[PDB]
């Protein structure tokens, strides 16, 4: 209906204009958003429930300092972490299949999931 949607306390915007990962991110930031941080399942689950088939860019990648993977946020979320399925051999940055999520080439261009948290109350 729209390319925006709220669930529960967060909202969501999907910029259908495919981009890199780097790309997607700087772009959520431009307008106060942020490359979607997932907090659990209820969010995994129904998130991919309806995505467009086209993959997309979510704020998880390989941080070096950490020399590990990470949320644009630097904070755990409850979500099954299988981080070991992944090689630097494939790619680095994290996308979101309709199926499940893989990594790979931050240069590969998909859509973004920019997310927000709606505290306060829409008026």
Coordinates of C-alpha atoms in Angstrom, one line a residue, residues 17-117:
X17 CA 15.8 2.6 -5.3
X18 CA 18.5 -0.1 -5.1
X19 CA 21.9 0.9 -3.7
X20 CA 25.0 -0.4 -2.2
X21 CA 25.2 -1.2 1.5
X22 CA 27.4 1.9 2.2
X23 CA 24.8 3.5 0.0
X24 CA 21.7 2.4 1.8
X25 CA 23.1 3.4 5.1
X26 CA 24.2 7.0 4.4
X27 CA 20.8 7.4 2.9
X28 CA 18.8 6.4 6.0
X29 CA 21.0 8.7 8.0
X30 CA 20.4 11.5 5.6
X31 CA 16.8 11.8 6.9
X32 CA 17.1 10.4 10.5
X33 CA 16.6 6.8 9.7
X34 CA 18.9 3.9 10.1
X35 CA 19.6 0.7 8.2
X36 CA 17.1 -1.7 10.0
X37 CA 18.3 -3.2 13.3
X38 CA 16.4 -6.4 14.2
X39 CA 15.5 -7.0 17.8
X40 CA 14.3 -10.7 17.7
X41 CA 11.8 -12.9 15.7
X42 CA 8.5 -11.2 15.7
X43 CA 10.4 -8.8 13.7
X44 CA 12.5 -11.2 11.7
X45 CA 9.6 -13.2 11.1
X46 CA 7.0 -10.9 9.7
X47 CA 9.7 -8.5 8.3
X48 CA 10.7 -10.9 5.6
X49 CA 7.0 -12.1 5.7
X50 CA 6.1 -9.3 3.1
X51 CA 9.4 -7.8 1.7
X52 CA 9.7 -7.2 -2.0
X53 CA 11.5 -10.2 -3.7
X54 CA 14.4 -8.0 -4.2
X55 CA 16.8 -8.4 -1.4
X56 CA 17.9 -5.7 0.8
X57 CA 20.3 -4.0 2.9
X58 CA 20.1 -4.1 6.8
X59 CA 22.6 -2.5 9.2
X60 CA 24.7 -5.5 10.0
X61 CA 28.2 -5.9 8.5
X62 CA 31.8 -6.7 9.5
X63 CA 33.3 -4.3 11.9
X64 CA 37.1 -4.7 12.0
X65 CA 37.8 -3.0 15.4
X66 CA 35.6 -5.5 16.7
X67 CA 37.1 -7.8 14.0
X68 CA 33.5 -9.2 14.1
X69 CA 30.0 -8.5 12.9
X70 CA 27.8 -5.8 14.3
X71 CA 24.6 -3.7 14.2
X72 CA 25.0 -0.1 13.1
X73 CA 24.0 0.2 16.7
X74 CA 26.9 -1.8 18.5
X75 CA 24.4 -3.6 20.8
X76 CA 23.2 -7.2 21.0
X77 CA 19.7 -8.3 19.8
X78 CA 18.1 -11.5 21.1
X79 CA 18.1 -13.0 17.6
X80 CA 19.6 -16.4 16.8
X81 CA 23.4 -15.3 15.7
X82 CA 24.9 -18.0 13.3
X83 CA 27.7 -15.7 12.4
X84 CA 29.8 -18.6 11.5
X85 CA 27.9 -19.5 8.3
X86 CA 29.7 -16.5 6.9
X87 CA 32.9 -15.8 4.9
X88 CA 34.7 -12.6 4.1
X89 CA 35.2 -14.9 0.9
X90 CA 31.6 -14.0 -0.2
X91 CA 31.2 -10.5 0.9
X92 CA 31.1 -8.6 4.2
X93 CA 27.8 -6.7 4.4
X94 CA 24.3 -8.4 5.4
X95 CA 21.2 -8.5 3.2
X96 CA 17.7 -10.1 3.9
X97 CA 16.2 -12.8 1.8
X98 CA 12.6 -13.6 1.7
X99 CA 14.1 -16.9 2.8
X100 CA 16.8 -16.1 5.3
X101 CA 19.8 -13.8 5.4
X102 CA 23.1 -14.0 3.8
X103 CA 26.2 -11.7 3.5
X104 CA 28.2 -10.6 0.5
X105 CA 29.6 -7.7 -1.5
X106 CA 28.7 -4.3 0.0
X107 CA 28.9 -3.2 -3.6
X108 CA 26.0 -5.4 -4.6
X109 CA 23.0 -3.2 -4.9
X110 CA 19.6 -3.8 -3.4
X111 CA 17.0 -2.0 -1.7
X112 CA 17.3 -0.5 1.8
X113 CA 15.3 -1.1 4.9
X114 CA 15.5 2.0 6.8
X115 CA 14.1 1.7 10.2
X116 CA 12.9 3.9 13.2
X117 CA 11.5 3.7 16.8

